[PDB]
Design a protein around this ligand. Sequence first.
Ligand code: NAJ
Ligand code: NAJ
Ligand code: PFB
Ligand code: PFB
Ligand code: ZN
Ligand code: ZN
Ligand code: ZN
Ligand code: ZN
Lengths: 374, 374
Amino acid sequence: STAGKVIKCKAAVLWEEKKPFSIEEVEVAPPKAHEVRIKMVATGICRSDDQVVSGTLVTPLPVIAGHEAAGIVESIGEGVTTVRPGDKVIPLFTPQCGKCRVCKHPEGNFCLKNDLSMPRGTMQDGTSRFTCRGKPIHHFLGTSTFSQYTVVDEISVAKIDAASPLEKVCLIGCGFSTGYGSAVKVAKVTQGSTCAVFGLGGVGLSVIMGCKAAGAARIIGVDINKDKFAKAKEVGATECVNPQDYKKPIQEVLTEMSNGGVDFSFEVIGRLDTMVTALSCCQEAYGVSVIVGVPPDSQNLSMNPMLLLSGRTWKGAIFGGFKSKDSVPKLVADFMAKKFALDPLITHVLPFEKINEGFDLLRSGESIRTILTF
Amino acid sequence: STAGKVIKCKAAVLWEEKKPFSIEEVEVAPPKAHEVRIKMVATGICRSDDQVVSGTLVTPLPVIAGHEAAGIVESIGEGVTTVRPGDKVIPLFTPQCGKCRVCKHPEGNFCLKNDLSMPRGTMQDGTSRFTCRGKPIHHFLGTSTFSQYTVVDEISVAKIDAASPLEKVCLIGCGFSTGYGSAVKVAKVTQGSTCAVFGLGGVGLSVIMGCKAAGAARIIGVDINKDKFAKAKEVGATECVNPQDYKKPIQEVLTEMSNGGVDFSFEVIGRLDTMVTALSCCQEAYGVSVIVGVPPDSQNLSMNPMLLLSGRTWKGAIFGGFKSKDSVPKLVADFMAKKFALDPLITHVLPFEKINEGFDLLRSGESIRTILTF
Ligand SMILES: NC(=O)c1ccc[n+]([C@@H]2O[C@H](COP(=O)([O-])OP(=O)([O-])OC[C@H]3O[C@@H](n4cnc5c(N)[nH+]cnc54)[C@H](O)[C@@H]3O)[C@@H](O)[C@H]2O)c1
Ligand SMILES: NC(=O)c1ccc[n+]([C@@H]2O[C@H](COP(=O)([O-])OP(=O)([O-])OC[C@H]3O[C@@H](n4cnc5c(N)[nH+]cnc54)[C@H](O)[C@@H]3O)[C@@H](O)[C@H]2O)c1
Ligand SMILES: OCc1c(F)c(F)c(F)c(F)c1F
Ligand SMILES: OCc1c(F)c(F)c(F)c(F)c1F
Ligand SMILES: [Zn+2]
Ligand SMILES: [Zn+2]
Ligand SMILES: [Zn+2]
Ligand SMILES: [Zn+2]
């Protein structure tokens, strides 16, 4: 029995920016009221985790990062009603409290209990459940999945199908659901439309999947790494373009290709310049552009508002617009029902001990998703 | 009996930026194929016409400005099918050719034959119908309503009810329709919502009318001229705020007043800083902000894209999102049926010869709309 006791386990601690993860023993406190302790089974490597390493996504350090995962409930605190010991679960980096004005809104998903806007790196109660070498360690987005065991608030966990394969469905905790929902829920891609997707990583591939599911006629993938094109075409891109191949700026190229602008564009990289390019390539009167990539901390973009005055719509979203706790179990059931595929996103499967190697595959351009297994 | 002949008439010619209009004789050529010559009856003074004088809205000079008007067809060119001599008409500063990809789209209204994006100051065939002192004079937006007679392309004119009061319905040619449609069509304001309207001129008052027609529960007007507040409350504002009264930035004030941000905000001024403030004050997860004001030429704004990534929508529109030639006659029929009021917008009436006094009233802050009568 571990229930009610401190667990000593392995975790990947990031002590300061621009350093490898350190794989060492941490102590994980038992869950308090309304908290859940989870034994991790699989976690993905998302570019957002790398941005924490880079320092472009700011969160308190030292930290246990990781937010795209799946595991099994080890124990529950007093008052927990939505999961039990032995349940398969996905932690939710966007919580769903069900009580705030956003949770009550039909189209909101960015719950006011989130730890994204103004990150504290704690549990809801303002404290940490983690220590390492006698020092308190911060949580990340109320998830912290780069650990054999984590503790999450009940509003930050969803119970999923007992038969689901956790080394695949961990992607429903971030990159699949984000990209797919950006297309089908946030943009509301229409049948017969032309879409442009900037960035052909795991999230951008998921946007392509959604555009194809929504019946887009043309899906133009855009990436500076032409090694990404073959998989983008496998999941539905009709054409791929590398901005580096052209004398003209790519917004001009895509406007020409689409006979006057695309219906829907997506920025799935995280750069200010590509957010403005993506907006500009959508048709001036009725185009929609969705920002999915996470921009660099504290930097503003510059843009001409005439792009909007002619009729364009610009919007962004976290987690594909999905209300997290309602939607994650439904997405897992849809995957079990063969409504969408996850294998095209998974290029590498490594033991958790090879986390640094996984990040080097992402940085070098080789991987889409590496799944780490515990 | 003027049909096929040059007409000599008075017009207000703008020879140079930052100068009074010159009321003097012009020559108006007869209409070519698919053109309509109109005897003007009434024209409004819109801030966009003043921005031309200021040089912040660029169009070629010398010019006959004016775009918000109503008149009576004097003659038609070869091939015209949609109006006849003696019909009451409103010139359309946004055309509706009915054939381009925008005109065919269900949402779009910014027809590709517009003269707004890259203004030439000509008719569709690239020539002018106006001479003054033996020199060619530019058109403005394909309308040029500050003249006793104008010539417009058939795609830039709508036939309206024969019993229409032209001294009121001229406002359907720009300010009323723009503001009202920005609320009801572009933003799609919902019953029970909270709205913020930045700028309480004739367009912003029309936005308030639309928000109240849509059932908003709270409509907060924002203006630095507190003399604007009484009329804003008459047409539906529930409260007004003057940014100059507050130590804190008005986005923070409006976020506090709305218990975490408004549902819908509207920028109806034309300044870069209020475009960013208006986006900021809508609720971060589900808010919508609409740009209606016309920004200063060739200037970029700076903003933090995290405002969008949390879930906000930012859009703009021309002419309230209305397909112009379909919509104008319906709006006139609705006015005739008392579905909305125009009198609250009309604060002054002057003869056309007093155009410079009408512009002085707008610049002083004293008027909403002055209507000029020919
Ligand atoms: N909104 C959310 O909820 C959410 C969720 C998941 C990820 N993200 C962000 O989404 C972005 C993509 O994540 P990911 O798919 O894991 O990353 P990724 O696998 O690194 O993919 C990014 C792709 O962009 C390509 N790229 C880089 N620079 C350019 C450029 N200038 N022009 C065109 N292509 C370029 C690059 O080659 C790569 O294939 C990151 O910014 C993440 O932080 C956001
Ligand atoms: N999108 C369109 O189709 C369209 C159509 C009509 C007008 N316009 C533009 O809409 C804008 C408003 O036109 P209008 O109603 O005729 O002008 P207006 O009558 O000048 O009203 C603008 C209001 O803004 C107020 N204002 C000025 N600066 C500020 C400030 N910093 N903060 C708060 N309030 C301030 C000002 O006191 C005035 O009451 C102008 O930019 C027009 O060019 C756009
Ligand atoms: O990849 C998902 C993700 C985000 F979308 C963010 F906006 C963020 F700040 C972050 F830390 C994160 F992990
Ligand atoms: O007031 C309507 C109006 C606009 F919305 C513009 F964008 C524009 F350039 C213009 F000249 C105009 F008159
Ligand atoms: Zn909530
Ligand atoms: Zn992620
Ligand atoms: Zn058209
Ligand atoms: Zn106007």
